[PDB]
Amino acid sequence: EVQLLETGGGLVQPGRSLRLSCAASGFPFDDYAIHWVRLAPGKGLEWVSSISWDSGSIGYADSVKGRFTISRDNAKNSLYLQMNSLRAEDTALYYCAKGAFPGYSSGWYYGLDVWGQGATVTVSS
Amino acid sequence: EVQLLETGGGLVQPGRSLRLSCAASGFPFDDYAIHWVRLAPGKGLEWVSSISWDSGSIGYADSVKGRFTISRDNAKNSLYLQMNSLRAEDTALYYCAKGAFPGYSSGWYYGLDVWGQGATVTVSS
Amino acid sequence: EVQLLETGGGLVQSLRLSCAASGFPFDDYAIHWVRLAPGKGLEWVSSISWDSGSIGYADSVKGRFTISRDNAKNSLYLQMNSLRAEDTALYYCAKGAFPGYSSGWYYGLDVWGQGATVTVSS
Amino acid sequence: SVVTQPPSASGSLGQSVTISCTGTSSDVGGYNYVSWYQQHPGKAPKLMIFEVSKRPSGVPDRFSGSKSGNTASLTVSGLQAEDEADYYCSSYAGNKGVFGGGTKLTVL
Amino acid sequence: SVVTQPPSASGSLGQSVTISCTGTSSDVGGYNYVSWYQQHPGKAPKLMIFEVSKRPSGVPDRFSGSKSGNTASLTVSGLQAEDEADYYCSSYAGNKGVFGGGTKLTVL
Amino acid sequence: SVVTQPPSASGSLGQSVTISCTGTSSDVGGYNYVSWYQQHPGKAPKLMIFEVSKRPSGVPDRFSGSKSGNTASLTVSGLQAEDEADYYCSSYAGNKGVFGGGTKLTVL
Amino acid sequence: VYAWNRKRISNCVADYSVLYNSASFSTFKCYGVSPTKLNDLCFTNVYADSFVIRGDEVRQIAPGQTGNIADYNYKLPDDFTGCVIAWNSNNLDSKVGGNYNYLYRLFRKSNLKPFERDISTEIYQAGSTPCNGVKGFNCYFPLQSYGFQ
């Protein structure tokens, strides 16, 4: 079956860094664009970042622009999110989600059909 | 009361990175320029970096120029210092200090009246 | 005596390797990484000059690995990101006979470390 | 940006409830690419609607989508116990996506 | 740059001690913006003097500042037990500041 | 690139065995910088030959190097029990080096 | 200095030679033009900005300078084309009991633009709470007196 699993969560102080990983299987990770979406406690879903199949198209939310760094390793079928200079409002549940079709914006066109279980990230002093 | 609290300290190997944060409260962080000053063991105070209220004016000491990166988030009332490629002589106690008046060089004009408790940084192999 | 010791190995589905040096002037010599894949032979990975002014990678890890060094700590590093199954090998830290960059190819690599194992499997 | 969504919705067993999703002319009212997601507690979201009104395989006919101006709506007829969950809307916004605030659906 | 400061100073209870702070024509001798700071062990520094000789609110009259050429001085009359601490001078240097080396003050 | 080496070699005790190392005109046949390495099981490689035919200190006269066109050879006369090991050749290739495939030497 | 006077001079023959040899000036620095060449130059207008400052603040009156006087009282452009003359006025602007009539701006949110005059006396808000025209904690009067003796 299709499957995504996020790793790298934990508690980290405001200003420090943390890197998240997403292991993929069950589908051709070589061709699909993948995205990060977080769920803040008390708030709703919030899109974090996106990266195309060849990393030729990359986008960030304004709240994490110049703060997070998305990347991928198609050989390892893994997606990464380097979070530096974390803030209290970055405390959320980060999801790894693939689109219905391999295009970059196609996950917005036809929805995000597959989601991972998520990895918790806490940013408190 | 006015208050500054530094976070992000610890031990890190020579060449690695470390990010410091300074949480502010009790005064209008939107308008004041903030600075970093470190205290090396056995030595005295040493100014590290400075950043104006809108990040329009930024300065570094020659020992950390092109090495540290200062920044701020006025919405979170937080100051940051990204330290990359750390050296043994970077081992010090890093202070977050605001000026008497909101100007950039005003902390040098009228002194630095408010200081944080500091965060320890050790750079050894 | 001259001595090199590699650390940072393990199993991974990124990974950073370190090489601690002693017994010789690490400030002046260029150091290299060479791996030994199970069933295959030696394969040169990367090289870096004394001041990092000259850096080279094999085509199989070009744009994938990042070599660096800290002369104050007498340490060499190799940041391996996006690892593949064929990256499973025994990574060696080796210095050249003379401090030049290509001198390890000119006169051979006389000192080798014990190596650190790296496994890339799901 | 921000996509306005009522914090809570309610409907009795077998009745219907509509969950609105209000954006601007650059997202909800600028394209026909509104999605809806269901999230049960402790589980990952599930795509329920894409392209305003299209249902993926595995979604019952009880869920239906519509849009009118800057406001997209999700109607759930014949409400059932398993429909109690959180519902978020999504919309395209020009190489970027944006979610709604979310609505807790209570089946009374 | 470097601002020269004697490593240690001393004075008896009730006496006076002057702590010099020597710079160049581009910092201490180039502006009238010399500051003095007191630091007790394990606690953050405290501003004692600004603009060479001005005292903030909360600093006793026993601390007084002066400058002469490239040398700024901090005089502490009527020395007291709580005055034992470290003292650093600061100076403006053109969009940059610089501290002195520091002086440990022992009240004998 | 690829430097061709036979997977296995053999020779009786006291006899001789030559291990070939074949490259191209841009490595083995382009420079006189061919090296040879010995590796016993579980131990780091040991430099045996550099510059095609030069021996470092500590290498017996039994090991000798030669080159002819794109083919470099390592000859081990008076074969001994301790000579059983793996042997790799190295060559310069223009700011880059390249190793041979390797040859297991069995002393029969 | 915060209310530095300005006089516009136009439609007249300027006498620079006699002007510069009348009194004894403790500071005379020109930028972008020599004192002796002004006798040959014509200009659309001339501006004479007059004020009083501290001696140690005289250095702040020049292109590319920073400080309280430069930032909040009187600012010159980096490409300033003109002359600065300064002379001690202790016998004129000093009183036995102290001459507090001369004032200077101490607190200001932002630095002045070149040739900008600010005469505002609004209470300066140094904190989050508004002052509402009441000076107190974190609410300071923007002007400070020299009190020359």
Numbering used by the authors:
A (entry chain F), B (entry chain H): 1 to 125
C (entry chain D): 1 to 13, 17 to 125
D (entry chain G), E (entry chain L), F (entry chain E): 2 to 109
G (entry chain B): 347 to 495
Please give me the paper's original passages concerning this structure.
S is the major surface glycoprotein on the SARS-CoV-2 virion and is involved in viral attachment to target cells via the interaction of cell-surface-expressed angiotensin-converting enzyme 2 (ACE2) with the receptor binding site, at the tip of the receptor binding domain (RBD), in the S1 fragment of S (Lan et al., 2020). Following attachment, cleavage of S releases S1, allowing a major conformational change in S2, exposing a hydrophobic loop that executes fusion of viral and host cell membranes, releasing the viral genome to initiate viral replication (Walls et al., 2017). In-depth structure-and-function analyses of 27 potent RBD-binding mAbs isolated from vaccinated volunteers following breakthrough Omicron-BA.1 infection reveals that they are focused in two main clusters within the RBD, with potent right-shoulder antibodies showing increased prevalence. In summary, we have presented a structure-function analysis of potent human antibodies induced by Omicron BA.1 breakthrough infection in SARS-CoV-2 vaccinated individuals.
